[PDB]
Curated annotation (Swiss-Prot):
Disease linkage: Complement hyperactivation, angiopathic thrombosis, and protein-losing enteropathy: An autosomal recessive disease characterized by abdominal pain and diarrhea, primary intestinal lymphangiectasia, edema due to hypoproteinemia, malabsorption, and less frequently, bowel inflammation, recurrent infections, and angiopathic thromboembolic disease. Patients' T lymphocytes show increased complement activation causing surface deposition of complement and the generation of soluble C5a.
Function: This protein recognizes C4b and C3b fragments that condense with cell-surface hydroxyl or amino groups when nascent C4b and C3b are locally generated during C4 and c3 activation. Interaction of daf with cell-associated C4b and C3b polypeptides interferes with their ability to catalyze the conversion of C2 and factor B to enzymatically active C2a and Bb and thereby prevents the formation of C4b2a and C3bBb, the amplification convertases of the complement cascade. (Microbial infection) Acts as a receptor for Coxsackievirus A21, coxsackieviruses B1, B3 and B5.
Binding partners and assembly: Monomer (major form) and non-disulfide-linked, covalent homodimer (minor form). Interacts with ADGRE5.
Post-translational modification: The Ser/Thr-rich domain is heavily O-glycosylated.
Domain comment as written in the entry: The first Sushi domain (SCR1) is not necessary for function. SCR2 and SCR4 provide the proper conformation for the active site on SCR3.
Whole-protein coverage range: 96 to 222 of 381
Disulphide bonds in the chain: 4-51, 35-64, 69-110, 96-126
Primary gene name: CD55
Family from the record: Belongs to the receptors of complement activation (RCA) family.
Domain Sushi residue range list: 2-66, 67-128
Tissue: Expressed on the plasma membranes of all cell types that are in intimate contact with plasma complement proteins. It is also found on the surfaces of epithelial cells lining extracellular compartments, and variants of the molecule are present in body fluids and in extracellular matrix.
Lineage: Eukaryota, Metazoa, Chordata, Craniata, Vertebrata
Protein name: Complement decay-accelerating factor
Length: 129
């Protein structure tokens, strides 16, 4: 007649495990949480969304935070340009020092929606010609 509905929703958290089925949960289910790309949980504790008593799933705090891109690092013989922030979905432009020609790329992308905070194309080259 009732059963547990669309489970609890946290600031960036969403169920990881095929615990769910997410159809009709009978009251009494401990489920586990997954943070979205570019998020970190709280200090990583009891990740327990129980279907409690009153189809009112149990505790729900803030099991996420955020993981933004941690700087594309530094290129070489030259330097790397950050227009004021390297968050998720960002990017840079490579600029070599004097006398050199960029032989690798003139940009690279911050993407998190694949393998967590990571960048596409690391060190190009700066080849003096």
């Amino acid at each position: 007649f009732r059963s547990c509905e669309v489970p609890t929703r946290l600031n960036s958290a969403s169920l990881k495990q095929p615990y769910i089925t997410q159809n009709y949960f009978p009251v009494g289910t401990v489920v586990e949480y997954e943070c979205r790309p570019g998020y970190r949980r709280e200090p990583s504790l009891s990740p327990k969304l129980t279907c409690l008593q009153n189809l009112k799933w149990s505790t729900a705090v803030e099991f996420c935070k955020k993981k933004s891109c941690p700087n594309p690092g530094e290129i070489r013989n030259g330097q790397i340009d950050v227009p004021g922030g390297i968050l998720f979905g960002a990017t840079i432009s490579f600029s070599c020092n004097t006398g050199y020609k960029l032989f690798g790329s003139t940009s690279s992308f911050c993407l998190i929606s694949g393998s967590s905070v990571q960048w596409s194309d690391p060190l190009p080259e700066c080849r003096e010609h």
